[PDB]
Design goal:
Blueprint (H helix, E strand, L loop, with lengths): L3 H15 L5 H14 L4 H4 L7 H19 L4 H14 L13 H16 L5 H22 L2
Helix pairs in contact: 1-4, 1-7, 2-4, 2-6, 5-7, 6-7
The chain binds protoporphyrin IX containing FE and cyanide ion.
Subunit structure: Monomer.
Family: Belongs to the globin family.
GO molecular function, one term: oxygen carrier activity
């Protein structure tokens, strides 16, 4: 759960993270750094490696989905219901054995890619609130995945 203050710094910094490309660039960097660090993850996604054209594609779709989750943070039941639906779709994605443990390393890569973009605006308060926001968004996706 996010506090009112955490919801506010997440909604505020998302404007800068989204940039003029709806976070597409942040997505490309997150997924390229993640798969370069964990080569074993390429197969879970069905990618050939970090250079596969699909990582820039999927990176834009993930960041665009985080953007609609950010627009619904004020209604928790709404945000978790729609992230559960995304999670239910993941049962049939990649190697079809996506595991809950894979989400915490992905989170670290996302927060670094966000910081890379926004610089000093991703301060300690922004990082804690985005860590809390990533915990709820992926947590709701995992619930759908395990349903
Ligand atoms: C390490 C964990 C994850 C894995 C292995 C994974 C894997 C995949 C794969 C393989 C696809 C491509 C499906 C296709 O070919 O159409 C996909 C699509 C998608 N993923 Fe993930 N995903 C993960 C985490 C996430 C997270 C954290 C989000 C949260 C926003 C997310 C959001 C999406 C979206 C929006 C799509 C596009 C299709 C749809 O809306 O269902 N994924 N994911
Ligand atoms: C998930 N991409």
């Amino acid at each position: 759960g996010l506090s009112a203050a955490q919801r506010q710094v997440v909604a505020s910094t998302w404007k800068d993270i989204a940039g003029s490309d709806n976070g597409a660039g942040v997505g490309k960097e997150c997924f390229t750094k993640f798969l370069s660090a964990h080569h074993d993850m390429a197969a879970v996604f069905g990618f050939s490696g970090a250079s596969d054209p699909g990582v820039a594609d999927l990176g834009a779709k993930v960041l665009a989905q985080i953007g609609v989750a950010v627009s619904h943070l004020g209604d928790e039941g709404k945000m978790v219901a729609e992230m559960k639906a995304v999670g239910v779709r993941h049962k049939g994605y990649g190697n079809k054995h996506i595991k809950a443990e894979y989400f915490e390393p992905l989170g670290a890569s996302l927060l670094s890619a966000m910081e890379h973009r926004i610089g000093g605006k991703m301060n300690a308060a922004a990082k804690d609130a985005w860590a809390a926001a990533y915990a709820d968004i992926s947590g709701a996706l995992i619930s759908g995945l395990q349903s």
